[model samples]
Target: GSHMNIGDTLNHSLLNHPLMLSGSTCKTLSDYTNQWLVLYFYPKDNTPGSSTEGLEFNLLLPQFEQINATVLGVSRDSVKSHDSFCAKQGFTFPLVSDSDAILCKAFDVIKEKTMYQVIGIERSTFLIGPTHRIVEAWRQVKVPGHAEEVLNKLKAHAE
Candidate 1:
């Protein structure tokens, strides 16, 4: 989306949006500065594909740490929903609650969906560098083996 692009620095509009995760609140982008970030937007929480995606990312947390990267999952679910999902899946990373679709709009992940005729966030992923510029953006992400691909990309670029 034009909100952000590769090599373009993050603006306050996106960075200043409220973020709530279990045990933490990210008030601004400065909280994530100086590290590689994998900001993934998912359609929903607690579903098979979404759960597996979070689990896979948690599974690769060690390798991600080695590359100085952090992973976060974003969904238009409530903090209570995120809390339940994380408890069920044992996610090691924070899951941001975008109940108002604030983050989704900023990332341009919200799209028309056909499953029940609704507008929702599409499955997408963005790799943001330490300087807060997007390194890559993946749209219409396929859940199977996607986390590994992200890890691979981090390894290739982080070094």
Candidate 2:
């Protein structure tokens, strides 16, 4: 079930959870105030679909920044996995490690995925406003043109 919807503010505890961004930095949701937060949760790192999705976001990173948006990727992968994936893809934005799945449970991205008759993350994205409320959500995301669609929505919302 979806725990969050448009106009719903996230819980304070979740907003303050220190997500490991990389070896050098950890950031909470509060750190992203005053800018639109683009938080994307994916199934895994280094896979084809996830790779293209990451590349797409990276391609639009500068434009997103120009519009006061910050993009962050989240997955159940460890910090080491995130670091390697970012390095391989040359991503400018930080990828958060949610190995404990606390973020996943909070956002309701985890589900019974058919990838192997296993439980895994359903590809999802959330756009959070400066007030820390969810503004838009895309669940069961398809990789093609998805990043562009989000960018367009963000521009429209900003205007």
Candidate 3:
């Protein structure tokens, strides 16, 4: 079940939750303050759809940075896998390794896929305002043109 909504303020308690970055560095959401955050959750790394999402975001990263927005990919994959994924794709944005899924549980992206007999993240994206509130959200995301939509939305809401 989705636990977040547009305009919903995120619990800063999870801001300090344990997570690893692509380079095996440790960080938390608290370190991303004062900028718009594009937090996207996918099932796994290096999958067909996952790669599409990651690449598109990577391609548009400069435009996002110009707007002071940071894009982060999240999954239950290890930091090691993330390292290879970013390297393989030349991704500029870092990926967040949430193997224990603290952030996933908080966002409630994990769900059972009855059709596929799989239970994992539901491929979701969140546009978090600098003030720690969810400004917009896209659930059950599709790969095609999705990154552009997020970019347009960020531009729409950007100051």
**Pairing residues by index, what is the TM-score of model 1?**
0.92
| Alpha-carbon deviation at 35 in model 3, angstroms | 0.5
Q: After superposition, how far is residue 106 of candidate 2 from its true place, in Å?
A: 0.5
- Per-residue lDDT of candidate 3, residues 1-159 (tens digit): 467888888776887776789998887787778999999998999999999999999999999999999899999999989999999988988999998888898898988878736889999999998888899889999999999999999998763
Winner on TM-score between 2 and 3 is 2
**How does candidate 3 score on lDDT?**
0.89
Residue pairs in candidate 2 whose N, alpha carbon or C atoms collide under 3 angstroms? none
TM-score, model 3 to reference: 0.95
Tens digit per residue, CA lDDT, model 1, 1-159 = 346556777787777767877555555555789999999989888899899999999999999988788898999888888888988889988998887787788788888867646998889999999989989888999999999999998888855
Which residue segments of model 2 deviate by more than 4 Å?
115-117
The 10-residue segment of model 3 with minimum total lDDT is 10-19
| TM-scores of the models, in the order given | 0.92, 0.96, 0.95
Off by over 4 Å in 1: 1-3
Rank by lDDT, descending? 2, 3, 1
lDDT of 3 at 101: 87
